[PDB]
Design a protein around this nucleic acid. Structure first.
Length: 157
DNA sequence: TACAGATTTTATGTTTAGATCTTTTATGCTTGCTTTTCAAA
């Protein structure tokens, strides 16, 4: 496993290669890199921070494709369990929920969540009614309209 | 206007809620000293 390794010498190009393995554009990848540099030391296992940062941005950037296909989540989790050479899927979840606590308040994470409309996996137009306690909020009980149209196309083909 | 009755005035007692002030005791900072685990050789 790469999450047990302590005090590793990370070049600046390995993080860009790991970000390009998850199709992150240049701004978010450079922000992950800069987030690594300002906490370069004070670090125990760099791979845990980089892995949590990359997957935390991955669920934000690709949140449109994660609502349509729930398999994408397992798929990306497994690519990660791989690039970290680990067979335990709870270590990756521990990594992302430990990195989320260090990134939940910054300005750039705020800009990313605003621009891709992520807000812990929710649109703003739903989360304002979850926070208000609306009776008329959208319930995850009925199928999505576009998902139902996609299924109707799948049975038409 | 006289008057019985009802209410007000003056006067005091009973009980609870809270304020203030003092005295003794907990506690938080200072500073110097000893032990201990964690980020490099």
């Amino acid at each position: 496993s790469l999450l047990v390794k302590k005090y590793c010498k990370m070049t600046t190009e390995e993080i860009i290669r790991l970000c390009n393995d998850f199709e992150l554009p240049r701004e978010v990848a450079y922000k992950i890199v800069d987030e690594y540099n300002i906490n370069a030391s004070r670090l125990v296992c760099p791979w845990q921070l980089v892995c949590g940062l990359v997957l935390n941005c991955t669920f934000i950037v690709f949140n449109e494709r994660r609502r349509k296909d729930p398999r994408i989540d397992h798929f990306i989790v497994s690519k990660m369990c791989s690039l970290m050479l680990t067979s335990k899927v709870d270590d990756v979840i521990e990594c992302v929920k430990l990195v989320k606590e260090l990134i939940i308040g910054e300005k750039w994470f705020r800009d990313l969540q605003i621009r891709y409309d992520d807000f812990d996996g929710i649109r703003y137009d739903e989360i304002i009614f979850r926070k208000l306690g609306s009776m008329l909020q959208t319930t995850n009980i009925l199928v999505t309209d576009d998902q139902y149209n996609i299924w109707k196309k799948r049975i038409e083909m």
